[PDB]
Amino acid sequence: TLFEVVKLGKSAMQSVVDDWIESYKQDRDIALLDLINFFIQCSGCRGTVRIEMFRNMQNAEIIRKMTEEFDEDSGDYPLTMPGPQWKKFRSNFCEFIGVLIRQCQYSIIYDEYMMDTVISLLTGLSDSQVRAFRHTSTLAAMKLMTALVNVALNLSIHQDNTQRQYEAERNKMIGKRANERLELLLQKRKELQENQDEIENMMNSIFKGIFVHRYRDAIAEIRAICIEEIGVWMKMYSDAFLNDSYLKYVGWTLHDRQGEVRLKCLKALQSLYTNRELFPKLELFTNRFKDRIVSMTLDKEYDVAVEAIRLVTLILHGSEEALSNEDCENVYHLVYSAHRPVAVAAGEFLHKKLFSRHDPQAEEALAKRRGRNSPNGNLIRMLVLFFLESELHEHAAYLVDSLWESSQELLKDWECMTELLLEEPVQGEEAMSDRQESALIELMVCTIRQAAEAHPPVGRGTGKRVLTAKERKTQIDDRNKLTEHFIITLPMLLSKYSADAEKVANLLQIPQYFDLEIYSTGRMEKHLDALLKQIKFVVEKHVESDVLEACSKTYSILCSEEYTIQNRVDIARSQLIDEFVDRFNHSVEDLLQEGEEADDDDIYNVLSTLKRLTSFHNAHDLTKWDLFGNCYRLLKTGIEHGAMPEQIVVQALQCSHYSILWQLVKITDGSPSKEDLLVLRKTVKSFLAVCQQCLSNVNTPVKEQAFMLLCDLLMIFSHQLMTGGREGLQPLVFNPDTGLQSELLSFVMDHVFIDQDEENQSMEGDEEDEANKIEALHKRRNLLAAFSKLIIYDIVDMHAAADIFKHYMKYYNDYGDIIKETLSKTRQIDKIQCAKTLILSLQQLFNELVQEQGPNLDRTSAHVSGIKELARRFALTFGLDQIKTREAVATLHKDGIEFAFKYQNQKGQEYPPPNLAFLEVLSEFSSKLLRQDKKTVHSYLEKFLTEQMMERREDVWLPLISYR
């Protein structure tokens, strides 16, 4: 029971190896029988070899008999059964072969007895048609010959030692005992020579009998295992295996059609590089198969791509010859891979390759920094140039993430490119180009944001991140050093780049990652205030919405009341908003009157000031300066006149909404009054009238903004306002208007559910520019999402959302996610009414079909097929999933039956029902999901039918037949 002893938890593998050695010394036949029985029961054959049947009759008929006597209960074999107990079985099996053959290498392995039978049986079973026998025999003989390779290595070392001692004696001819030692060494050398010849004989026998047959085998895993292990051997025994005689098989196997075999080929090739260099035949094969290696860089499997990139890195360690510049740019594009390990491997290769200004990839004192503020400048320089040439990305986020861990020491040396950006270093280089300036600033944005937060961006995200102590302490002192460095650098950074809008927008994302109590410890609030005045100059010099958003977000980050500086920053915030209030009042009180003219200058001043006010009012409570009077006067004169720019109205509407929501903030504070409550409700009602007028206004972005503002107003006054333990907010609650609901539905249908260019309510996007179709599609998805969010929270009538549910196939790619989620949520809110509106959606589509085609309805057309497919996916959306499972199905069936006989035919004939093809739609909802309620639904169905309708069975009433 050596199979069971090795399998079922062997305490010491060398112990049973020595037991087999002792039994072999006792009697060769019984130990050979035990080893053969072990191998056969390792093959999955439950037959047991006996003494006479092993001794007398040959191995091929043994193989035939055990094929007949396999005695299976399943097709599985011990190399593929689930895991644990069998995994450690396989490991024990391999270790038993290795230790058993390697331990006998001194005296037992030259008896010329066991290996003949073992080789014959294993070769025959590797030529056997049974996959189990082939796999098990290949593994057994494969570990056998691996052990024989180790024995050959030991014999070669012994030959080297005895040759050295023979030459050492041949130096010294003095001594008769020395001559006797020389003759003993010669006899030992001859014994080792004949032992080596025998080992070579069994080596060649096993090789030409097994490996040549089984690397052409139809099983991928046998070839993969063979190639991986042959690379292991050629890594460890390069004396005889490092030649083309074994590399021809590797070259032939590199073109395998299976990913795992090629993975093992790349592992073998890396084993030729790891960890020793250099060999000429290795570089010859590298230059021979550079094209195949770069082919595997773009393989389907991510693992094969990673191994190919690592082999390329190994070649760069060893050769620097075979790789071409186009291959280099291919890997530079692989830096932008979606899969993070591939990108990180490519970035590590890039760091190894293109960074040799003063680092020779060698020892220090000239490699990291030469004690000056200059050596690392050129590394920064081809970072900038690489970002310039990499036109596959406007941002170096993926590039920096790939180059993060490989260049950790280089990416924290922010002071170096800081002097190479602002203060004109002593290197005598050219002027820092504006495109290069923006590229370097984008690189800094990426590097410091990855310095603060360590999570990779979206697509590279994992969510299974754990922070070690080293990680968190590196994060903290990294935060400290960036804080103290950049509170110094940002003042003259802004002073150099005040007028550059995009550079300011990029630079003001870092202060989200600044520990503000360090200012209290560092006493650098004065530099904070200098940067506040500098960004005040930017704000008063820039009118861009994006930079105002960035500034407002930066202020909100530094408006952290948990830090002492909140008063000091609130000084500057109040000062700047007070300036903007004064400027807004001065400009508005002259713009609202007609006068002369109003010209473009006053329009520009009003628009810029209101942009700034709206932007800084989004993130900050500024209702102490009640400018809703000016904004509402501007909105009402926009209503009355209508001849003035769009953006001013957009800014006024958004600023008024911001004021309203900031007032809404300070009523849930536990102190609600009533006079200001009614005042706020009246202002909200006026804002609702203005928003309805703007929705009726001809301008379509104004229509969308009015729609989303109305969405915000309705969710503010939604039914879930009463959830959070509120009592006095009940007067504030305002119900939707049915005409307003119809206007909203009409707007949504005219401006959302469009997938063609015929409507012309969606901007073109044909040219692959910043004005692509994707922006319009995502904006329409956002508007539909806001509308559905109003729908699902008991605010607006969801019979209007039935018309949204009906568009699930015409807009599957565009809005199928939104329609499916809305249907699921409305099912979770009220499944009965959800099913009623679902069958209403089907009725609406069917009535559109009635309008388009008439009462014949074209029952075999694509429209009916699409409606029936929609019915199928709706029926599988139901079932036993929520409460009132079949009651909703019964209600849907009753509604469908009512609709199928809703209209009666005037001519030809009275009993044929119009809208009969809806029974085909309902037949998908009947199917076989239910069984007991089918009788009740049929009883409801037969109320509208007659016996004359029962008896007729033709093409017109085929929907009725299919439903019944």
Partner: peptide
């Protein structure tokens, strides 16, 4: 290069 020319069977 001629040893790597596959002519087996």
């Amino acid at each position: 290069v001629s040893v790597y020319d596959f002519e087996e069977e």
